Swiss-Prot record, chain A:
A Gene Ontology molecular function term of the record: S100 protein binding
Designated name of the protein: Fibroblast growth factor 1
Any one of the GO BP annotations: activation of protein kinase B activity
Gene name, Swiss-Prot/TrEMBL: FGF1
Effect of K124A: Loss of LRRC59-binding
Expression (tissue specificity): Predominantly expressed in kidney and brain. Detected at much lower levels in heart and skeletal muscle.
GO CC annotation, single: cytoplasm
Family: Belongs to the heparin-binding growth factors family.
Quaternary structure and interacting proteins, as annotated: Monomer. Homodimer. Interacts with FGFR1, FGFR2, FGFR3 and FGFR4. Affinity between fibroblast growth factors (FGFs) and their receptors is increased by heparan sulfate glycosaminoglycans that function as coreceptors. Found in a complex with FGFBP1, FGF1 and FGF2. Interacts with FGFBP1. Part of a Cu(2+)-dependent multiprotein aggregate containing FGF1, S100A13 and SYT1. Interacts with SYT1. Interacts with S100A13. Interacts with LRRC59. Interacts with CSNKA, CSNKB and FIBP. While binding with LRRC59, CSNKA and FIBP seem mutually exclusive, CSNKB and FIBP may cooperatively interact with FGF1.
Provenance organism: Homo sapiens
Protein modification: In the nucleus, phosphorylated by PKC/PRKCD.
Top-level division of the source organism's lineage: Eukaryota
Subcellular location, record wording: Secreted; Cytoplasm; Cytoplasm, Cell cortex; Cytoplasm, Cytosol
Statement: the UniProt record of this protein carries the keyword Cytoplasm: yes
Swiss-Prot record, chain B:
Glycan attachment sites: N78, N91, N115, N147
Consequence of substituting Q139P: In CS and JWS
Protein name per Swiss-Prot or TrEMBL: Fibroblast growth factor receptor 2
Interval of the full protein contained in this chain: 151 to 313 of 821
Organism domain of life: Eukaryota
Lineage summary: Eukaryota, Metazoa, Chordata, Craniata, Vertebrata
Effect of S102F: In APRS; requires 2 nucleotide substitutions
Family classification: Belongs to the protein kinase superfamily. Tyr protein kinase family. Fibroblast growth factor receptor subfamily.
Length: 145, 211
């Protein structure tokens, strides 16, 4: 029953490393060492463990625990890995109606550029995203089931 | 006349289905064959019975699908579709992960920060424990004086942020005070906020003479 159902979630769970699972194709957001960003279905991949943190209320950094690179979106709406934290690394984390998270570029919030992953596992471009695609829906998951 | 085959594997390339608890999950295995093959679903390698989950589940032969509404944590597991006719049988297994999501302001653990007492020159710490889905922002605040007063003409107390979450801050959940003075005594507040709302709890620091 609802009373019997068990599921971790201790205090401080928000600071443990997470995987950003995209329901679109079922890929985990990945930040490669060379700075490129894409998705992968390999849960054992060492570049999908991310550390999220609120730099300002509702504004987060998404960092690769493996390389220390920060997720970021350039003026063209392209995702890339940044070695140092900057204004293009901040995203507005919000929970949508169906309880998935969306991450919008703070820098380009007015244009509604989201972090997104296509079914083929490649990163979506900011200008090509919009409130309705499955490509922008994410679920932060524990590193291991 | 032929053994079963898949009609649309594209809709089967997803190796992990992670869904928010309370949402509906749908699995499909478009099949073909002659005679028309029959479909059956297994959970963790065994017959999936309606009584295995409250509210049971529904199947749609027209779509070769299995549907489970209002998923709960215990729904996690492997779901195998078995398609077969007299000439053969084929199958595919999907894995389901369920995660509890919550759109709520932060929740603080009762009792923290806890009061603390030390002597002049001593060190102390205050701990704050938070439950928050949306990333939380923590700040430690002290109720301070200004011109000898602790409140302004508008009734607002004078406050001072001692520290807050950020990449330039180590251990946001813990406020550590060193080589304390009687001037450090007072109320220390942990205020935690996410885009949905905030919560706060405080503790009192008592500073005794060195004697």
């Amino acid at each position: 029953t609802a009373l019997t159902e068990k599921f971790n979630l201790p205090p401080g769970n928000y600071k443990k490393p997470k995987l950003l699972y995209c329901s679109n194709g079922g890929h985990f957001l990945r930040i490669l060492p060379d700075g490129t960003v894409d998705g992968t279905r390999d849960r054992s991949d060492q570049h999908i463990q991310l550390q999220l943190s609120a730099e300002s209320v509702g504004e987060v950094y998404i960092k690769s625990t493996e390389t220390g690179q920060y997720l970021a979106m350039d003026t063209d709406g392209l995702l890339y890995g940044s070695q140092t934290p900057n204004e293009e690394c901040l995203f507005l984390e919000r929970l949508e109606e169906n309880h998935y998270n969306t991450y919008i570029s703070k820098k380009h919030a007015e244009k509604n550029w989201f972090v997104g992953l296509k079914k083929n596992g490649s990163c979506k471009r900011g200008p090509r995203t919009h409130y309705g695609q499955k490509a922008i829906l994410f679920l932060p998951l524990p590193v291991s089931s | 006349k032929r053994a079963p085959y898949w009609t649309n594997t594209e809709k089967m390339e997803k190796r992990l289905h992670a869904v928010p608890a309370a949402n509906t999950v749908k699995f499909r295995c478009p099949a073909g064959g002659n005679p028309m093959p029959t479909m059956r679903w297994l959970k963790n390698g065994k017959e999936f019975k309606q009584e295995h989950r409250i509210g049971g589940y529904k199947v749609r032969n027209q779509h070769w699908s299995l549907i489970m509404e209002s998923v709960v944590p215990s729904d996690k597991g492997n779901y195998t579709c078995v398609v077969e006719n007299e000439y053969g049988s084929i199958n595919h297994t999907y894995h389901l992960d369920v995660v509890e999501r919550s759109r709520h302001r932060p929740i603080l653990q009762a009792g923290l920060p806890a009061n603390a007492s030390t002597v002049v020159g001593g060190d102390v710490e205050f701990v704050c424990k938070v439950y928050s889905d949306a990333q939380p922002h923590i700040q430690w605040i002290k109720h301070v004086e200004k011109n000898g007063s602790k409140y302004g003409p508008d009734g607002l107390p004078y406050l001072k942020v001692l520290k807050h979450s950020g990449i330039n801050s180590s251990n946001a959940e813990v406020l550590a005070l060193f080589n304390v003075t009687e001037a450090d005594a007072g109320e220390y507040i942990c205020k935690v906020s996410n885009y949905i709302g905030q919560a706060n709890q405080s503790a009192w620091l008592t500073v005794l003479p060195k004697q």
